[PDB]
Amino acid sequence: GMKPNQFLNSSFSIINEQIEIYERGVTTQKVNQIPKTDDIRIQSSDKPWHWLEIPDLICVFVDMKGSTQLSVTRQDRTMASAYQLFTNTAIQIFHDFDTPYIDIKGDGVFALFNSNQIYRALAATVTFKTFVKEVFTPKIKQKTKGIIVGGHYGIDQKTVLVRKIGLRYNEVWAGKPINMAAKLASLANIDELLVSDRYFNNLKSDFVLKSCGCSELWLPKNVTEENKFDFNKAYSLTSAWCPIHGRFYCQNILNLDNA
Amino acid sequence: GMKPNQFLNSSFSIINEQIEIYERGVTTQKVNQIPKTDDIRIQSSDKPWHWLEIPDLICVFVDMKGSTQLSVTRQDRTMASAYQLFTNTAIQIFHDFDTPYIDIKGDGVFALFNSNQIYRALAATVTFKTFVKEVFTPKIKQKTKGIIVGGHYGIDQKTVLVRKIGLRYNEVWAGKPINMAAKLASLANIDELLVSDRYFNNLKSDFVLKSCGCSELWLPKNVTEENKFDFNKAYSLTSAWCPIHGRFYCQNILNLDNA
Ligand SMILES: [Cl-]
Ligand SMILES: [Cl-]
Ligand SMILES: [Zn+2]
Ligand SMILES: [Zn+2]
């Protein structure tokens, strides 16, 4: 129902071009793991959009929480320092866990994992969560003389589509889990990880379901009235790596993907 | 703080490296407009992080709303087509409005504008909003035989910091307006734009404050109890370009930045 006098001429022409592209339909092809970036082809502009379908991809999203009083303009520039200590550490930790794909969005970082990296994704997320709780929050509190800033985290797992868009070219991701992992992180309290029920249902080991004894780690949370999610239930983890047993637990959990 | 038995050895070493970087402090320098990407220098890794301070930068964030039933796996693959029709049109429209910087995050797109592009940012946002209402929503409803999918939108304006991080290199943005524009969009209803009070307070012309008569366009909304924003009030726009007067209004609004 678009009319010429409703839009700029250029906008009108662009919208009609996008309508034509949309009317071409799509094609897809299955690829079991996140492909190398150069294996994602740039298409000729006349073709129907082609997507690669990655099954049961895991998306972790971590975001700074409680930072509204941190500043980029006042003398201490504390938001700049906090951004580095939070985001750069997130990136380096996810890289150390051999994350297939990392990207930065606002005050947050998302990390994509393959469907056979369930436990690796969790171990990387809990490592970052523990860093934030034990290091980031105390140091920012020291610098600000009292402000408590931390993180909150979400994980979802679902099939996604990927292709490249030129703005160079970047991967673009269509589907549920990146959007849903970010929405879960936004819903989470400070120092809380929320995961979807479909991701939680893939966690089977007592190394991740029960504490070290220093109890059930995960609590269900109904998310239906949020009107944001295509699943009924999330699961909440508020604990972190044990100061005594955390390394041993992380070692075992990482190995759980190899079986 | 950190204990060695709480983390993997590699994670421990990485955290200590990030603490050292954080303890170097930061330096900043003012640049009045969003710089060219090659003017944002890559630093040697030993230096305190340097940031460019861009005053009163405008961030628009547009996001798909109501898409939980769209699928990337069922036969119609409707989420793939919808992603193209929504996101690619957003990209092309923002490029047509000469947006200095565009980036894609999940089901959404953000566009950054200079402080002297107040009205251009609004005109680009309302153009995309009108496209979504008049074109995207009807076509997706037709394809799905009834599902109503649309968009929601946020705008904030505040000083930001920018530098480059290598994961070639990408700009990273620290500060309020990208995070806050995304949170405003998440808070917005379908076919609703929410803007911060500080952005709204820069809107002075009746071309943006009053309708063509086919009334006040903006309604205040208190956002204090959201505990997410560093401002008290947002402003809601639910209208779109008039089917008769929309081109004329958009043209005049664009001209408002040149005075
Ligand atoms: Cl600030
Ligand atoms: Cl889906
Ligand atoms: Zn223990
Ligand atoms: Zn009118």
Residue numbers in the entry:
A (entry chain A), B (entry chain B): 0 to 166, 177 to 223, 233 to 277
Give the published text:
3’,5’-cyclic uridine monophosphate (cUMP) and 3’,5’-cyclic cytidine monophosphate (cCMP) have been established as bacterial second messengers in the phage defense system, named pyrimidine cyclase system for anti-phage resistance (Pycsar). Until 2021, scientists reported that a group of bacterial nucleotide cyclases, which utilize UTP, and CTP to synthesize cUMP and cCMP, defend against bacteriophage infection, proving that cUMP, and cCMP are authentic second messengers controlling anti-phage defense in prokaryotes. This anti-phage system, termed pyrimidine cyclase system for antiphage resistance (Pycsar), contains a pyrimidine cyclase PycC and a receptor protein with either transmembrane domain (PycTM) or Toll/interleukin-1 receptor domain (PycTIR). Upon phage infections, produced cyclic mono-pyrimidines activates their receptors PycTM, which disrupts membrane integrity by forming transmembrane-spanning pore, or PycTIR, which deplete NAD+, leading to growth arrests and cell deaths, thus protecting the uninfected bacterial populations, a strategy called “abortive infection”. In this study, we aimed to structurally, and functionally characterize both cUMP- and cCMP-synthesizing PycC and cUMP receptor PycTIR.
Here, a clade D PycC from Anabaena sp. (AnPycC) was chosen for structural and functional characterization. The crystal structure of AnPycC was subsequently determined to 1.8-Å resolution. AnPycC contains two nearly identical polypeptides with an r.m.s.d. of 0.13 Å for 259 Cα pairs, two chloride ions (Cl−), two zinc ions (Zn2+), two acetate groups, and two glycerol molecules in the asymmetric units. AnPycC forms a tight, head-to-tail homodimer with catalytic centers located at the dimerization interface, with a buried surface area of approximately 3,700 Å2. The zinc ions are coordinated to the C221, C223, C260, and H263 sidechains on the surface of AnPycC. Notably, these four zinc-binding residues are highly conserved among the clade D PycC cyclases, but not clade A, B, C, and E PycC cyclases. Notably, AnPycC has an additional C-terminal α-helix α9, named zinc-binding ribbon, which further interacts with α4 and the N-terminus of the opposing protomer. Mutating three of the four zinc-binding residues abolished the production of cUMP by AnPycC and render the AnPycsar-expressing E. coli cells sensitive to phage infections. Superimposition of ATP-bound adenylyl cyclase (PDB: 1WC122) with AnPycC revealed that the active sites of AnPycC are too small to accommodate nucleotide substrates, suggesting that the AnPycC structure presented here is in its inactive state conformation. Importantly, in contrast to previously identified residues, Y50, D94, and R97, of clade B BcPycC for pyrimidine base selection, it is found that F60, K104, and F109 are located at the nucleotide-binding pocket of active AnPycC and are highly conserved among clade D PycC cyclases.
